[PDB]
CSV table of C-alpha atoms (C1' of nucleotides) and ligand atoms in Angstrom, one decimal:
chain,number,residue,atom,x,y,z
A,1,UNK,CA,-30.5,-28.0,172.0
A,2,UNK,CA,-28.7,-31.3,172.1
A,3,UNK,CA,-28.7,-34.5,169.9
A,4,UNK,CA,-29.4,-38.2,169.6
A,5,UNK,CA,-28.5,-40.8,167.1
A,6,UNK,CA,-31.4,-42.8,167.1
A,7,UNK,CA,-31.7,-46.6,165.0
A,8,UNK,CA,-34.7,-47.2,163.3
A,9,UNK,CA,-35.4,-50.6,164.3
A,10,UNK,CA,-36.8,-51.5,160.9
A,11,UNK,CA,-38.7,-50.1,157.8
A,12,UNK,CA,-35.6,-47.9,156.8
A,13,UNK,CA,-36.3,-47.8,153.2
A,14,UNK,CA,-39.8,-46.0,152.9
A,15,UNK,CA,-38.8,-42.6,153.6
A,16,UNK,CA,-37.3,-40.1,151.0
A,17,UNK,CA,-35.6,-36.8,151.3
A,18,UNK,CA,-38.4,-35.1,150.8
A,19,UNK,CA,-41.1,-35.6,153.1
A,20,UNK,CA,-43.9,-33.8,155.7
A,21,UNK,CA,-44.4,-34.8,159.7
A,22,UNK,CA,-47.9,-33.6,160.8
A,23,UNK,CA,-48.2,-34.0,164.8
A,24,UNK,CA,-51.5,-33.7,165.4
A,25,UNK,CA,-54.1,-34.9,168.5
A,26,UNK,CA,-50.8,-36.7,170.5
A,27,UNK,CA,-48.5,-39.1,168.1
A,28,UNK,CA,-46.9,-37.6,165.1
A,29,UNK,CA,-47.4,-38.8,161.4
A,30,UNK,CA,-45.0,-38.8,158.6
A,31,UNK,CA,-46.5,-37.9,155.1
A,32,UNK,CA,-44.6,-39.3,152.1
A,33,UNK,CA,-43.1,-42.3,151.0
A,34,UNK,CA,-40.9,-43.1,148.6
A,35,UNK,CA,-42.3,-45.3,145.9
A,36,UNK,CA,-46.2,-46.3,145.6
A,37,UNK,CA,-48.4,-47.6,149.1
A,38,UNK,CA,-47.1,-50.8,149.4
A,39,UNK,CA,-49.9,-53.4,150.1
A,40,UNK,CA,-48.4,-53.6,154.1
A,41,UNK,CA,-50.1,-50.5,154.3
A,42,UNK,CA,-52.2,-48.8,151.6
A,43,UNK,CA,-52.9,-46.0,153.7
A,44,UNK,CA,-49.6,-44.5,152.6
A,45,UNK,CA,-49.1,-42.6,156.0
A,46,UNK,CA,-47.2,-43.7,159.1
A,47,UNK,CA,-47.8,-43.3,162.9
A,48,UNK,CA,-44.2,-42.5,164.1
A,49,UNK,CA,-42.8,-43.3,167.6
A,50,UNK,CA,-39.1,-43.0,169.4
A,51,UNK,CA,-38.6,-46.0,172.0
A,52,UNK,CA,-35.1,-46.0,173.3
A,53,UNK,CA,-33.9,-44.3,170.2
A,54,UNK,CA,-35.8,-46.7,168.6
A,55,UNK,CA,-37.3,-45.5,165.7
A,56,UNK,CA,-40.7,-47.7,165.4
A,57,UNK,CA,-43.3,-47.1,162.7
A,58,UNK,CA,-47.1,-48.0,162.7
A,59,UNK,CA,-49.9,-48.5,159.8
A,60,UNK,CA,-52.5,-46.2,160.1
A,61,UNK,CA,-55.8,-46.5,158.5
A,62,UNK,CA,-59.1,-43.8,157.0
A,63,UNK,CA,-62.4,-43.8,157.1
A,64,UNK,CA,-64.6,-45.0,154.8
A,65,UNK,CA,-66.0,-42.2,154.0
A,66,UNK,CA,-62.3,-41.0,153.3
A,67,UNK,CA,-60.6,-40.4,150.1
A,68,UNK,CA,-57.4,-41.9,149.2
A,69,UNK,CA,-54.7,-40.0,149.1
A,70,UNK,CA,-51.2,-40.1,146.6
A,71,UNK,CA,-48.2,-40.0,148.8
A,72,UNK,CA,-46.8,-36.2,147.6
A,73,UNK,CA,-43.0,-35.6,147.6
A,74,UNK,CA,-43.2,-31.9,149.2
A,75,UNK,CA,-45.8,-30.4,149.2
A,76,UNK,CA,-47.5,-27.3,151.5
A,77,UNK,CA,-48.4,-27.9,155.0
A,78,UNK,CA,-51.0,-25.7,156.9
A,79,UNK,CA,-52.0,-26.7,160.5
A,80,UNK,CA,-55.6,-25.1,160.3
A,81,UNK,CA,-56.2,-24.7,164.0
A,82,UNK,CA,-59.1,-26.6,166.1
A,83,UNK,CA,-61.9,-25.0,165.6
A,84,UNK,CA,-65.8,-25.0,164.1
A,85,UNK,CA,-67.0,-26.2,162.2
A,86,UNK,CA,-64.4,-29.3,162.1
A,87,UNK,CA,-61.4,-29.6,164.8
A,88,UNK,CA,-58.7,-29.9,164.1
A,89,UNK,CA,-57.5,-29.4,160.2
A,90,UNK,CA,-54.7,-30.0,158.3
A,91,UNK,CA,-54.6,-28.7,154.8
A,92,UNK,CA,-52.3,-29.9,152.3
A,93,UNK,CA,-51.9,-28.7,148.6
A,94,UNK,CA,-50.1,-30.4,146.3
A,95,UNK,CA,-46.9,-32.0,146.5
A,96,UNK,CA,-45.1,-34.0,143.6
A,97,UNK,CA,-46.5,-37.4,142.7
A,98,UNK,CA,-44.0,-40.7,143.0
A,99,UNK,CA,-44.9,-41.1,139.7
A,100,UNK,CA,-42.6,-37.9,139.1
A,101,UNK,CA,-46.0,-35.5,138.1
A,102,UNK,CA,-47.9,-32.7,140.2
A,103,UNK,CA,-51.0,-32.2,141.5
A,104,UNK,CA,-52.9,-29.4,141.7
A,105,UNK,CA,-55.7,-31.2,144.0
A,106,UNK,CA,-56.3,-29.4,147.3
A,107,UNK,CA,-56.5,-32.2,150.6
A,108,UNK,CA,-57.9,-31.5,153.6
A,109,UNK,CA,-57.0,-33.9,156.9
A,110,UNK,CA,-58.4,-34.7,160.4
A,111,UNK,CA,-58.5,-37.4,162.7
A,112,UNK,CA,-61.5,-39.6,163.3
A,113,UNK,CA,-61.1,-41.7,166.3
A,114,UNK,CA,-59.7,-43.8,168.6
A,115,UNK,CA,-58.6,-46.9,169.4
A,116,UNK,CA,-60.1,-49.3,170.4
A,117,UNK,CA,-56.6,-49.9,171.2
A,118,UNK,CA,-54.8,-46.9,170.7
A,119,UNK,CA,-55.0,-46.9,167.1
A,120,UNK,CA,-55.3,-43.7,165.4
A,121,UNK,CA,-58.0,-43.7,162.5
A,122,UNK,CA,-57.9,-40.7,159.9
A,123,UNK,CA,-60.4,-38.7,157.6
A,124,UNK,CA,-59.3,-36.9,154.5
A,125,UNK,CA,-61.3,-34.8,152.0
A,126,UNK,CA,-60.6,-33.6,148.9
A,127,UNK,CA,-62.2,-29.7,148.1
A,128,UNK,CA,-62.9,-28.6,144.7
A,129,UNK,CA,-61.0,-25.7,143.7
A,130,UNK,CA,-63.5,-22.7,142.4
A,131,UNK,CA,-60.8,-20.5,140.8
A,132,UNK,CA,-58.8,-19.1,139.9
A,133,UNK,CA,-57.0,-21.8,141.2
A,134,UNK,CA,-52.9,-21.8,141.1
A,135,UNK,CA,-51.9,-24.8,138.6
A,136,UNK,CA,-49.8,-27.1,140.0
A,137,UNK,CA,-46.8,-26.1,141.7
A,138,UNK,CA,-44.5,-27.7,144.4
A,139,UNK,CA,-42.3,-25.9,147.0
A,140,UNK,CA,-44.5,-23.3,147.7
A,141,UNK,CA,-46.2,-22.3,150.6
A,142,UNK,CA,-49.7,-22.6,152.5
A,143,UNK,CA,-51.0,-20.4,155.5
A,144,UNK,CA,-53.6,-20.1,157.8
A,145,UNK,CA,-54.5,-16.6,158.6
A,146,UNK,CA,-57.3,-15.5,160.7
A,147,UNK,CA,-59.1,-11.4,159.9
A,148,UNK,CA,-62.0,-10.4,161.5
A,149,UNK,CA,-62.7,-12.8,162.5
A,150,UNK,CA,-63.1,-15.3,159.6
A,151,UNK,CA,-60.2,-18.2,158.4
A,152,UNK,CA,-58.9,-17.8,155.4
A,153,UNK,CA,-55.5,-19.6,153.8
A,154,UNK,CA,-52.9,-17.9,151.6
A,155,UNK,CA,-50.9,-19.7,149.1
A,156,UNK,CA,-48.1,-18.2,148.0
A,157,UNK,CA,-44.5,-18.7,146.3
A,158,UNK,CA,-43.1,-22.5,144.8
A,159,UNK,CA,-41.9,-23.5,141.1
A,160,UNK,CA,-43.1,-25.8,138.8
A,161,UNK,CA,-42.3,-27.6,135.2
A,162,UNK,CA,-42.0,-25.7,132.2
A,163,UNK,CA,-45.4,-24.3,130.9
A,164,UNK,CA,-47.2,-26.4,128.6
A,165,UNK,CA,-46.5,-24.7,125.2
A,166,UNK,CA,-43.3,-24.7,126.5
A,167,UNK,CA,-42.9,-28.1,127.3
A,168,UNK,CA,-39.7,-29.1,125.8
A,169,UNK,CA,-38.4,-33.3,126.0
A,170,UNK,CA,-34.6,-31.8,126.7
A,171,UNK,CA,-35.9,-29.6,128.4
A,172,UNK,CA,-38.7,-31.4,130.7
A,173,UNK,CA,-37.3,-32.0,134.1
A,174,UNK,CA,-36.1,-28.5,134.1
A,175,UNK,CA,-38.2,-26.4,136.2
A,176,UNK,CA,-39.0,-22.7,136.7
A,177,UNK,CA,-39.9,-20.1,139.0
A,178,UNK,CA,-44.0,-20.1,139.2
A,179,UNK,CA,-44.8,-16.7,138.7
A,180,UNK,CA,-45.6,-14.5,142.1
A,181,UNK,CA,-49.4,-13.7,142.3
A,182,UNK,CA,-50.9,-15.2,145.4
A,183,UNK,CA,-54.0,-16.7,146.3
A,184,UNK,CA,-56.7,-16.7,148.8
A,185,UNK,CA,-58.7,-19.6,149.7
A,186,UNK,CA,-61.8,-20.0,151.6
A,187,UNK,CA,-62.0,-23.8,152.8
A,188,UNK,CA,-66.2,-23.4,152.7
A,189,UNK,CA,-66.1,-22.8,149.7
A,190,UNK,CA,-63.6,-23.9,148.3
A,191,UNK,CA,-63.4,-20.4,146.2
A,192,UNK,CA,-60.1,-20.0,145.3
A,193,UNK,CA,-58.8,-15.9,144.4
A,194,UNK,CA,-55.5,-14.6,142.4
A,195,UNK,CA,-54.5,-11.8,144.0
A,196,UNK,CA,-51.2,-9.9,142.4
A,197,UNK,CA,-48.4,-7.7,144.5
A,198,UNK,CA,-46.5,-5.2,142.6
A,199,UNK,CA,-43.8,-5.4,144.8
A,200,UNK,CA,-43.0,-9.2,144.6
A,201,UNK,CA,-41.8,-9.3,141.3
A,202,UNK,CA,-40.3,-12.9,141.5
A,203,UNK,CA,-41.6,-16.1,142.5
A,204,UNK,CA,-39.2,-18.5,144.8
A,205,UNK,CA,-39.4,-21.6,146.7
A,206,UNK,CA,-38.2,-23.3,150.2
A,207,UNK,CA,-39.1,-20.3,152.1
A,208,UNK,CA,-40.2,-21.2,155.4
A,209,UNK,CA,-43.5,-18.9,156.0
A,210,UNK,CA,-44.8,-18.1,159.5
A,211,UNK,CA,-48.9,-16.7,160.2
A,212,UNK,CA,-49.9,-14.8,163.3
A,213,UNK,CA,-52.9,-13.1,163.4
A,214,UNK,CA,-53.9,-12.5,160.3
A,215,UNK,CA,-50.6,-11.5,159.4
A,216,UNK,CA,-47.9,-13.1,157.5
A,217,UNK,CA,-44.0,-13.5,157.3
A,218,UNK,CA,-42.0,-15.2,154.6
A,219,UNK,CA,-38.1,-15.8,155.6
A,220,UNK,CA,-35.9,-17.8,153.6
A,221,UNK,CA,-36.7,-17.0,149.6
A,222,UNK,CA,-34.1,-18.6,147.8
A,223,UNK,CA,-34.6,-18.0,144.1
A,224,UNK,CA,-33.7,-20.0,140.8
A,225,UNK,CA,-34.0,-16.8,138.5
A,226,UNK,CA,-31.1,-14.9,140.4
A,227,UNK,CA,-29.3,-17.4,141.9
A,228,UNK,CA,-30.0,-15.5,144.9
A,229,UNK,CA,-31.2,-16.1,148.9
A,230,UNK,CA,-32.3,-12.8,149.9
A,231,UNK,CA,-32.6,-12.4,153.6
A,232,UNK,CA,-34.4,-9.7,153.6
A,233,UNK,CA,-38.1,-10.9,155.1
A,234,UNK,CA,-41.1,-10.5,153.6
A,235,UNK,CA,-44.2,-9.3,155.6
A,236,UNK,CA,-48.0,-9.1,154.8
A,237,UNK,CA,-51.1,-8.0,156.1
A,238,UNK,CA,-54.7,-8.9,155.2
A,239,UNK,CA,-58.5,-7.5,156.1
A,240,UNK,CA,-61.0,-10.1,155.2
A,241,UNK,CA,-63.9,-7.5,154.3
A,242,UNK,CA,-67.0,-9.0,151.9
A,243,UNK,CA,-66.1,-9.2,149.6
A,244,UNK,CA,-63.3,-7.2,149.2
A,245,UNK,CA,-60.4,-8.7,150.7
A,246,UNK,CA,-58.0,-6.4,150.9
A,247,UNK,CA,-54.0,-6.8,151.2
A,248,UNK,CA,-51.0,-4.9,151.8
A,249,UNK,CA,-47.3,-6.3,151.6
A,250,UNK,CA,-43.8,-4.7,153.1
A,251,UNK,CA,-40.2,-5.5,152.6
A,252,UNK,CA,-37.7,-5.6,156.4
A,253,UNK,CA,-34.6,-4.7,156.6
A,254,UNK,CA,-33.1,-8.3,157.9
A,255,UNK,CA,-34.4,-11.6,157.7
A,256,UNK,CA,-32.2,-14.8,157.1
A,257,UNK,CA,-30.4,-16.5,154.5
A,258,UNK,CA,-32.4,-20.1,155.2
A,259,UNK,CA,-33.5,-22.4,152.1
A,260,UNK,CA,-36.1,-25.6,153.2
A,261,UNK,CA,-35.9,-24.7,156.8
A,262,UNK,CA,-37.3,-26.9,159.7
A,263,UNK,CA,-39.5,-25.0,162.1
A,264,UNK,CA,-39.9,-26.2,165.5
A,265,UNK,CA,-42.8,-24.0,167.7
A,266,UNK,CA,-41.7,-24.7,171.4
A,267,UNK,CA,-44.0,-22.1,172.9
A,268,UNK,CA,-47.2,-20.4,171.5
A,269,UNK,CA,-45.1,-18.3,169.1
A,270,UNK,CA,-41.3,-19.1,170.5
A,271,UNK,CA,-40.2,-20.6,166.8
A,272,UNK,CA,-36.5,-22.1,166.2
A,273,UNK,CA,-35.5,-22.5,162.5
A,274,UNK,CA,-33.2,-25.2,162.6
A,275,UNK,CA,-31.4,-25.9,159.7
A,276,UNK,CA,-31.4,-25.7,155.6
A,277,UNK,CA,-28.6,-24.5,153.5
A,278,UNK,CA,-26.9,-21.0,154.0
A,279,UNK,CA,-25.7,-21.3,150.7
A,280,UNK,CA,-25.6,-23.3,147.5
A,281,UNK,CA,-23.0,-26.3,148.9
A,282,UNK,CA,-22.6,-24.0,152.9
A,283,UNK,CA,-25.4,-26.5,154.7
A,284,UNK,CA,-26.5,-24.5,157.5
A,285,UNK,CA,-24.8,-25.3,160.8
A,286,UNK,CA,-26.3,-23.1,163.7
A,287,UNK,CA,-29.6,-22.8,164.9
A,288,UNK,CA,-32.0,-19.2,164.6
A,289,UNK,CA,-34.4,-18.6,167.2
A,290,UNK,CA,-37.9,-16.0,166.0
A,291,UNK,CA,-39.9,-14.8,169.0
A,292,UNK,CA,-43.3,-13.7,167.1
A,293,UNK,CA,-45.4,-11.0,168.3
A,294,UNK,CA,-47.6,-8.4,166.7
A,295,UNK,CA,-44.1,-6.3,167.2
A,296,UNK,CA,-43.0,-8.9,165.1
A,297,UNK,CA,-40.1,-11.3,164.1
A,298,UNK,CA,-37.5,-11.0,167.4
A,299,UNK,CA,-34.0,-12.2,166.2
A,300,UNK,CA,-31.4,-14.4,168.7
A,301,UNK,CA,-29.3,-17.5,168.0
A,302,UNK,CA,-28.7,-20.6,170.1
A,303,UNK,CA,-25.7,-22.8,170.7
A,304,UNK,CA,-26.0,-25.4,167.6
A,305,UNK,CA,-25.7,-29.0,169.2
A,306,UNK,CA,-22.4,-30.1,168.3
A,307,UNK,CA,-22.5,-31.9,164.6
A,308,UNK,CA,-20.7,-34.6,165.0
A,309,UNK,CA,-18.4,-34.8,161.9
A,310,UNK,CA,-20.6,-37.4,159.9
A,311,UNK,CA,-23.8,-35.1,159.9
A,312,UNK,CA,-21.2,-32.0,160.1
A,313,UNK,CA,-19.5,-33.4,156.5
A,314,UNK,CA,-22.4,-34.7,155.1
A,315,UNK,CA,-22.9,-33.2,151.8
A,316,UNK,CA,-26.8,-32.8,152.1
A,317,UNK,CA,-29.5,-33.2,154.9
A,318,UNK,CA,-33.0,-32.6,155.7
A,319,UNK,CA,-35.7,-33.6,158.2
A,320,UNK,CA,-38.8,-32.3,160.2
A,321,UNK,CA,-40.9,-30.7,163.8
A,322,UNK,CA,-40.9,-33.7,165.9
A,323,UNK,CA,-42.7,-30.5,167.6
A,324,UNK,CA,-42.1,-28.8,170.8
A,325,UNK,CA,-38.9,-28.2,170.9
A,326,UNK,CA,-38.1,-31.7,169.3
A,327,UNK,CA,-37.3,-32.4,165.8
A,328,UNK,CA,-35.8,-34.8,163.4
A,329,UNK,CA,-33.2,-34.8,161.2
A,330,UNK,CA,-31.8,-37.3,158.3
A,331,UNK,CA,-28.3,-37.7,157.0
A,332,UNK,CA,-27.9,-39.6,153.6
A,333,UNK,CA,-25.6,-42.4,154.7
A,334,UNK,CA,-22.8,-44.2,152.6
A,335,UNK,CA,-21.6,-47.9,152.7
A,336,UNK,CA,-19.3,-50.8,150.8
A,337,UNK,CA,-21.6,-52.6,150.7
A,338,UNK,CA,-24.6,-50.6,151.3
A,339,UNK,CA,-26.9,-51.7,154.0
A,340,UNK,CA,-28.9,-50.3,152.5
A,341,UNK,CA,-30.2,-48.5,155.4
A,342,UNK,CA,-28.5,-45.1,154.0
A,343,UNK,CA,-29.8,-43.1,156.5
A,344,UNK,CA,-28.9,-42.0,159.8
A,345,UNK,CA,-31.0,-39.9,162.4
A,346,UNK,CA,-30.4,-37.9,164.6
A,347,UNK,CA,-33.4,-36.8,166.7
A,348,UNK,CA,-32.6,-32.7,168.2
A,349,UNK,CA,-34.2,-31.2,170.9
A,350,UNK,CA,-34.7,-27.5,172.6
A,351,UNK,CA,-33.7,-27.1,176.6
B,1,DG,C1',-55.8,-59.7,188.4
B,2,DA,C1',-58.6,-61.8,184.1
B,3,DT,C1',-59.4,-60.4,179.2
B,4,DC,C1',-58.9,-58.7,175.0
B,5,DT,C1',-56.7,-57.2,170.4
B,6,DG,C1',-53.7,-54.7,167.1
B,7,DG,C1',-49.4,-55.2,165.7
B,8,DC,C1',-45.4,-57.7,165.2
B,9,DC,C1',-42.4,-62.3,163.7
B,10,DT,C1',-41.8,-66.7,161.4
B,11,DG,C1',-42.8,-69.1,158.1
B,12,DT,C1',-44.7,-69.0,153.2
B,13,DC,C1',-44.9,-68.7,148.3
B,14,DT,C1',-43.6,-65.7,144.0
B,15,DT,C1',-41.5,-62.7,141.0
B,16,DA,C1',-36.5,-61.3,139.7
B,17,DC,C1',-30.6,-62.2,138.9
B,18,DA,C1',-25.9,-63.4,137.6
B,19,DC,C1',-23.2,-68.2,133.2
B,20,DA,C1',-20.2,-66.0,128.7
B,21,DG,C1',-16.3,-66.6,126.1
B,22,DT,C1',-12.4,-68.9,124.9
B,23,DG,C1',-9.5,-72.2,123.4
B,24,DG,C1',-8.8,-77.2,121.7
B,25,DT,C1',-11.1,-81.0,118.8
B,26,DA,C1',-13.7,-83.3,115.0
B,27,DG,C1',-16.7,-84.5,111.5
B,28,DT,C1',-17.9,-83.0,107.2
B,29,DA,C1',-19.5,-80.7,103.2
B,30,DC,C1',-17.0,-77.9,99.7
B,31,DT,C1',-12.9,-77.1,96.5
B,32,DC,C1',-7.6,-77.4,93.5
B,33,DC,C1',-2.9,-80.6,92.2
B,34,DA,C1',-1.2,-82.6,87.5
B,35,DC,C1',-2.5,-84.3,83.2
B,36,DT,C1',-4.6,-82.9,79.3
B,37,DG,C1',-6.8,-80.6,73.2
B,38,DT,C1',-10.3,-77.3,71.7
B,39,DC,C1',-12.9,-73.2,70.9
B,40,DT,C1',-14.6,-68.2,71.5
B,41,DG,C1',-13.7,-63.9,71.8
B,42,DG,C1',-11.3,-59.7,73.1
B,43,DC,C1',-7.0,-57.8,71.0
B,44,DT,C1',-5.0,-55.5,65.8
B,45,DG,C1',-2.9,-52.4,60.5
B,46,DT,C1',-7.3,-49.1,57.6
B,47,DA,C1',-11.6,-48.4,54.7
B,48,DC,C1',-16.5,-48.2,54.9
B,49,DA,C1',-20.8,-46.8,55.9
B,50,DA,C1',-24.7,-45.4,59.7
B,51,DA,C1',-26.6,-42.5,63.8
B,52,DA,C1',-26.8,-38.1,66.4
B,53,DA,C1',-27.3,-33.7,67.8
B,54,DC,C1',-26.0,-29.1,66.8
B,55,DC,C1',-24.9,-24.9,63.8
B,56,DC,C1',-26.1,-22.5,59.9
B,57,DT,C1',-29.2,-21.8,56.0
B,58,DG,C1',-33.5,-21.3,53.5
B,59,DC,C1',-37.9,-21.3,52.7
B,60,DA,C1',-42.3,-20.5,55.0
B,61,DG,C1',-45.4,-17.6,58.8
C,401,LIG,CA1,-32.2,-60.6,134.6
DNA sequence: GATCTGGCCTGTCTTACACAGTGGTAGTACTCCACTGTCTGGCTGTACAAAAACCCTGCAG
């Protein structure tokens, strides 16, 4: 639980508030960049590496067998653990285009190879959606959930542009609540299920979700509709029976008031939600430690590494899991003139 | 310790971005001075005729 100001040695104009790091198979790999692949790499991912608190980043490169993939703005993340029939997957689904627009294609990623020379190559496949599928939608949430004994993903929660009778020119960027029915996905085949909840009567967005077998835990939940960041948690449990599968959902007591959260997992479940907003300007400050067992969520803080007063002031802020206890954080950085390297980082770690 | 190779640096070539706006100066194409004498066409006192659109009336249905 301390901090680093790092330097990004160069290339310190690609990356965008909104963004996703994947570590997967050793080095990590940010997702997202602003503007279109520029031709120095039109992969449109980056290897990422910390030398010295130098921040260096690397081209990667697919398959050719691989499709090609639009940088998305946030999207959902799912880390489909390494197993049969393809180790290990990562399942994305859908982000916001740079070309401000959504997309309700469905990505599947895994790494290929290596090196000859320690280069990283990549494979990514797009999955037709046999639905049923959720229309496009940005904020929300993908899970990996594992019942008896099969995988299955839930998709559940995010907003999205008005709907399309509705579309209005004054009132276009303006975006709503998607409504709350979630979704069940089998990735072979891609059949994709609606599934409704009588007790979530509200969609939201930002909420950091958390899967443990086959069962799954929604903090955060901050809502346009109400204004509101309910705490309160929201658990579910599913039984994958053919082809019935069946689905049961429960309010708690206490959860957190956390909106776009970064999770770091340090041990197999030992989770630390880092930071977000506690409230519409409030920035969240300390740090929020989740043991997860099939008891369940296991609440304790941690000493929050001392902000020092740039990152502490700073309006806004964002970032992502380094992993294992490590993580990275962005601050939006002023200037007269501006560098225009406008952001700082500050690169946080556990023990 | 020899070898190899992706990734990085230097140098390269290409597409953008401020330079308007303000005053003094000059050539130059377009327009009233005075002097003129003449003509047309509006003005004016009533009386005379000609059109116009209605309102009554009368015959016709
Ligand atoms: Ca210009």
């Amino acid at each position: 639980m301390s901090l680093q100001p790092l330097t990004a040695v160069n290339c310190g104009s690609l990356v965008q508030p909104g963004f996703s790091l994947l570590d997967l198979e050793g080095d990590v790999y940010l997702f997202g960049q602003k503007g279109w692949p520029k031709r120095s790499c039109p992969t449109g991912i980056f290897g990422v590496r910390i030398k010295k608190g130098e921040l260096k980043l690397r081209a990667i490169s697919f398959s050719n067998n691989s499709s090609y993939l639009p940088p998305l703005r946030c999207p959902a993340i799912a880390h489909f653990e390494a197993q049969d029939g393809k180790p290990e997957c990562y399942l994305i689904h859908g982000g916001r285009t740079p070309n401000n627009e959504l997309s309700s294609s469905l990505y599947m990623l895994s790494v290929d190879s290596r090196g000859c020379n320690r280069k990283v190559t990549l494979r990514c496949e797009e999955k037709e959606l046999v639905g049923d599928v959720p229309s496009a939608r940005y904020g929300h949430t993908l899970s990996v959930i594992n019942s008896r004994g099969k995988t299955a993903c839930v998709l559940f929660g995010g907003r999205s542009y008005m709907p399309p009778t509705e579309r209005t020119t004054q009132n276009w960027n303006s975006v709503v609540d998607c409504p709350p029915q979630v979704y069940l996905i089998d990735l072979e085949f891609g059949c994709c299920t609606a599934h409704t909840l009588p007790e979530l009567t509200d969609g939201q967005s930002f909420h950091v979700a958390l899967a443990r077998q086959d069962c799954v835990y929604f903090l955060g939940g901050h809502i346009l509709s109400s204004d509101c960041r309910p705490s309160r948690l929201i658990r579910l449990h599913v039984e994958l029976l053919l082809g019935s599968p069946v689905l049961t959902c429960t309010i708690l007591h206490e959860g957190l008031t956390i909106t776009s959260a970064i999770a770091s997992p340090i041990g197999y479940h030992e989770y630390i939600i880092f930071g977000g907003y506690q409230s519409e300007t409030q920035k969240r400050m300390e740090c929020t430690y989740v043991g997860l067992d099939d008891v369940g969520v296991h609440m304790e803080s941690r000493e929050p590494p001392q902000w020092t007063s740039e990152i502490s002031h700073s309006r806004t802020w964002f970032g992502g899991s380094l992993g294992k206890g490590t993580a990275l954080v962005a601050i939006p950085s002023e200037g007269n003139p501006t560098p225009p390297e406008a952001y700082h980082f500050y690169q946080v770690s556990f023990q």
